[PDB]
Amino acid sequence: SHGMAVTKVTVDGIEFPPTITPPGSSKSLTLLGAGVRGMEIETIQIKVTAIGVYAEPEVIASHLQKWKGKSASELVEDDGFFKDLVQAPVEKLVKITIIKGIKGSQYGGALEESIRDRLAALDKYSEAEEEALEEFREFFQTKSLPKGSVIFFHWPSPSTLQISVSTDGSLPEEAEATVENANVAAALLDVFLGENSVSPSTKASVAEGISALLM
Numbered sequence: 001s002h003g004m005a006v007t008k009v010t011v012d013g014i015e016f017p018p019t020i021t022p023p024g025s026s027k028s029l030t031l032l033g034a035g036v037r038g039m040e041i042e043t044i045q046i047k048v049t050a051i052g053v054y055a056e057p058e059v060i061a062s063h064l065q066k067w068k069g070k071s072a073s074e075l076v077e078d079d080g081f082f083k084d085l086v087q088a089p090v091e092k093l094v095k096i097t098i099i100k101g102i103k104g105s106q107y108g109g110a111l112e113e114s115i116r117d118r119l120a121a122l123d124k125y126s127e128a129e130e131e132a133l134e135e136f137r138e139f140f141q142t143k144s145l146p147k148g149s150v151i152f153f154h155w156p157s158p159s160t161l162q163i164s165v166s167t168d169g170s171l172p173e174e175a176e177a178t179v180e181n182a183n184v185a186a187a188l189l190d191v192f193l194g195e196n197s198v199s200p201s202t203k204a205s206v207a208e209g210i211s212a213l214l215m
């Protein structure tokens with residue numbers, strides 16, 4: 001439209017939709033915040049993906065009431081806030097837009113090993129998690145992730161992880177994989193929102209969104 005107000009959200013120029021329906025779901029989630037995942041390799045700051053976090057705004061707000069009135073800065077500096085967010089028993093979705101093309105096995109292998117190690121550090125790695133991580137890794141082995149492809153990670157509840165990939169950025173229609181393991185599902189969300197997050201900018205953006213939502 002050239003005549004009515006339009007809203008656009010961008011992460012370094014990359015558009016994110018302000019709302020999304022998870023693959024295979026029927027309900028609509030709103031963008032809480034989004035950021036870039038950068039990697040410093042041999043002193044070069046490479047942008048590799050953009051990450052958007054979605055949930056039902058009023059619903060997630062109702063599960064974060066103690067944080068009401070906190071500014072974005074106060075939330076971003078508080079590990080307890082992000083732990084509440086990761087644990088909140090509400091539907092969540094993370095949309096990843098691939099910036100640097102990569103093989104699925106490389107993306108999935110790196111993430112799987114990080115989850116393995118992070119779970120081990122917390123003493124939350126047992127045979128159940130090992131098995132779930134094999135399922136996770138094997139899903140990504142079947143995919144290619146060229147520039148512009150999208151990954152949808154969907155948590156219909158905190159113990160269930162659904163995954164879908166689109167190589168053209170399109171939104172899939174049912175989940176391609178379902179991994180039933182509470183610890184792996186939570187650990188993946190924590191890769192984005194927890195300590196030693198891969199994207200401080202995503203965390204900061206989500207803190208801004210939630211701070212505003214709560215007020």
Ligand SMILES: O=C1C[C@@H](c2ccc(O)cc2)Oc2cc(O)cc(O)c21
Nearest residue numbers: 048049098099100101102110111114
């Ligand atoms: O460089 C990597 C490897 C990978 C990764 C590296 C370290 C780590 O701890 C976890 C994952 O993430 C990526 C994602 C991309 O779209 C493109 C990339 O080139 C990369």
Ligand SMILES: [Cl-]
Nearest residue numbers: 037049051096
């Ligand atoms: Cl990522």
